[PDB]
């Protein structure tokens, strides 16, 4: 498969795209972020494996970034296949309790770094980790840039379809979805997972999609 791809989203905000073939889905796209502060690189998200997140890494090593943290959206390998790798390399990675929690229950390497806050500015008034609520998952968190208003939803933003229901909480997902909305209303941009990136519209398609979902389940 391809090499991971990245590419720049505006001033210190670039996405990070990977591939990975996943049992039942065949290939899969995953978008993440890099998120810089001053020569400080934050990695939102890892891509599925250790040789994609090096990639990655040396991408912006090279051109003089330090990797000063990395933070998990959810437990499932395409948030969390670089955790392992980036713990040997020194890089700080940080994943909610819950995760962590989650990672350890599937006999998978956590992240070093823990908290329980709803709310967690991994970067004061840079980049805040914010927990919705279950949806996707028990754990997925989202992932705010006050400066640029951009969201990142992981796989908890799913405009046209929920995707893997196997860890999902379909009761939770439209709640979740709804304070999400009320918390993130000012977006100008809205980043997922697997889905084309848009603007806040796309927590309203999510929150239709998770209703739909729970009616038909
Ligand atoms: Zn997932
Ligand atoms: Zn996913």
Request: charged share 25%; net charge neutral.
């Given at each position: ?46 891509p599925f494996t250790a ?91 989202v992932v705010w840039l ?21 860890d999902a909480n379909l ?47």
């Amino acid at each position: 498969l391809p090499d991971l791809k990245i590419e720049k989203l505006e001033e210190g905000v670039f996405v990070h795209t990977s591939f990975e073939e996943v049992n039942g889905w065949g290939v899969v796209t995953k978008h993440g972020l890099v998120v810089l502060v001053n020569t400080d690189a934050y990695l939102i998200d890892t891509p599925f494996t250790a040789t994609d997140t090096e990639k990655l890494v040396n991408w912006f090593v090279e051109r003089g970034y330090e990797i000063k943290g990395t933070i998990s959206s959810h437990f499932h390998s395409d948030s969390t296949g670089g955790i392992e790798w980036l713990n040997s390399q020194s890089i700080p990675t940080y994943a909610s309790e819950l995760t962590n929690e989650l990672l350890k229950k599937s006999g998978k390497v956590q992240a070093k770094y823990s908290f329980s806050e709803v709310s967690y500015w991994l970067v004061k008034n840079k980049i805040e980790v914010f927990y919705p609520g279950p949806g996707h998952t028990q754990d997925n968190l989202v992932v705010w840039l006050p400066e640029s208003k951009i969201l990142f939803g992981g796989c908890f933003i799913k405009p046209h379809g929920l995707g893997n229901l196997g860890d999902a909480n379909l009761e939770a997902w439209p709640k979740s979805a709804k304070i999400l909305m009320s918390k993130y209303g000012k977006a100008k941009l809205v980043v997922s997972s697997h889905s084309e990136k848009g603007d806040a519209s796309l927590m309203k398609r999510t929150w239709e999609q998770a209703l739909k979902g729970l009616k038909e389940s």
